[PDB]
Design a protein around this ligand. Structure first.
Ligand SMILES: Cc1cc2c(cc1C)N(C[C@H](O)[C@H](O)[C@H](O)COP(=O)(O)OP(=O)(O)OC[C@H]1O[C@@H](n3cnc4c(N)ncnc43)[C@H](O)[C@@H]1O)c1[nH]c(=O)[nH]c(=O)c1N2
Ligand SMILES: C[NH+](C)c1cc(NC(=O)CNC(C)(C)C)c(O)c2c1C[C@H]1C[C@H]3[C@H]([NH+](C)C)C(O)=C(C(N)=O)C(=O)[C@@]3(O)C(O)=C1C2=O
Length: 373
């Protein structure tokens, strides 16, 4: 019959994009396994919420039959812009006509939606892919301290830091020159009451002198905030130890010195911080043209970009929707031609998304930016 009849697909990485790719193939009768580094699905995913947009992220969920399950676990949320003094400068609340536009979902809820939709044993846990080798017809996959597997098609979906890209591209991940510190506060109504009342059930964003603060007061009962700034030149080839909360507190309280005490309370009561340099996997010249066997990349492994334009997962789920339709629609003469068609479209929307990310990033970290239009 079709391109993948009597063939199996290996997806590397069980993030939202890989699991979506698995669902869209599996529901067309395709033999697909997902190899995920993580030991069990009972592991907290650290991060904020994700919003699926109409026409991209939501299309993927709709084609999968999971769009209602997403709406049931997602939460529409307004945005408040505030100054460093705790003045609300602007309050965009959720008009009921727009409540389906991009409601926020917890990363563990999205993962659980996608896992429950797959056949038992679709995802193989504790499988860290370390290397690929193409045979005559099949790839051999090598995992850390676990037996090898084979596949006719490999889809790299294992995130922005993937080390298994080289059969697709020699493109290297780059630092953009911004740095992000993320943290969670449990029971924020009790533990950061001032900042919680400032948020007032809305997301909050504030900018003063090249420091940006973002918060969501309701990621499944926890408040999630991030502080972003131009990487201090001091930290060329980090003078802050992120395992030492006292060191991060001391750095942040100096940087936030002229901010209202409701923001400094955030910094003071945070049990642990996570620091990460902003990185991009730049889409430039095309990828390797003549690969030994069929292989491609979707999600952050394809187009990792700064998280400043609300884009990221949406272009990933668009990757999964286009590749899965190309592999299953009957229109292509080979797996290679289905892949080429996916990559050619992804290079267009992906270059646009990356350009918008990089532009927002340049603008937002002028030493004199405020969210004010
Ligand atoms: C601080 C911050 C904040 C945001 C965002 C990023 C960052 C850094 N993003 C971007 C968004 O998080 C991102 O686009 C998606 O997580 C990408 O999904 P993927 O499944 O491609 O990768 P993701 O990285 O989520 O998943 C990769 C998976 O592969 C696994 N893995 C890694 N190496 C492996 C190996 N060798 N073998 C097997 N498994 C392996 C990992 O364990 C993980 O499960 C975002 N986006 C958005 O739309 N809205 C937002 O608000 C934000 N906010
Ligand atoms: C420019 N800022 C205001 C922005 C814009 C958009 N959307 C757009 O620009 C798209 N606008 C169109 C639809 C094209 C008209 C955005 O979509 C976003 C954001 C902000 C980011 C902030 C992210 C932040 N990061 C740096 C880690 C963060 O910590 C939080 C948080 N703790 O709540 C975020 O909210 C953040 O992850 C995020 O999701 C942002 C946006 O979604």
């Amino acid at each position: 019959m079709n391109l993948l009849s009597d063939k199996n697909v290996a997806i590397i990485g069980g993030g939202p994009v890989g699991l979506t790719m698995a669902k869209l193939l599996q529901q067309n009768g395709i033999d697909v396994s997902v190899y995920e580094r993580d030991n069990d699905r009972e592991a907290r995913i650290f991060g904020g919420t994700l919003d699926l947009h109409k026409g991209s992220g939501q299309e993927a969920m709709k084609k999968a039959g999971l769009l209602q399950t997403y709406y049931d676990l997602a939460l529409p949320m307004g945005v408040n812009i505030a100054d460093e003094k705790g003045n609300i400068l602007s309050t965009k609340n959720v008009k009921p006509e727009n409540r389906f536009d991009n409601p926020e979902i917890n990363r563990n809820d999205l993962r659980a939606i996608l896992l429950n939709s797959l056949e038992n044993d679709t995802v193989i846990w504790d499988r860290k892919l370390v290397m690929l080798e193409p045979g005559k017809k099949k790839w051999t996959l090598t995992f850390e301290n676990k037996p090898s597997e084979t596949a006719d098609l490999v889809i790299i979906a294992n995130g922005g830091m993937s080390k298994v890209r080289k059969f697709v591209t020699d493109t290297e991940v780059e630092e953009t020159g911004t740095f992000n510190i993320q943290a969670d506060i449990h029971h924020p109504e009790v533990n950061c009451p001032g900042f919680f009342q400032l948020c007032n059930g809305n997301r909050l964003m504030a900018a003063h002198q090249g420091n940006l603060l973002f918060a969501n007061p309701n990621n499944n009962g926890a408040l999630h905030f991030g502080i972003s700034f131009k990487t201090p030149d001091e930290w060329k080839n980090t003078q802050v130890d992120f395992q030492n909360r006292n060191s991060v507190v001391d750095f942040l309280l100096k940087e936030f010195s002229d901010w209202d005490e409701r923001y400094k309370e955030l910094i003071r009561v945070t049990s642990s911080f996570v620091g990460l340099a902003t990185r991009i996997f730049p889409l430039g010249k095309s990828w390797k043209s003549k690969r030994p066997l069929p292989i491609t990349m979707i999600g952050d492994a394809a187009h990792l970009m700064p998280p400043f334009a609300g884009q990221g997962v949406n272009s990933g789920l668009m990757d999964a929707l286009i590749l899965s339709d190309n592999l299953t629609n009957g229109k292509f003469n080979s797996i290679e031609e289905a892949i080429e068609n996916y990559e050619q479209q992804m290079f267009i929307y992906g270059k646009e998304a990356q350009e918008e990310s990089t532009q927002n990033e340049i603008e937002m970290f002028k030493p004199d930016f405020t969210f004010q239009q």
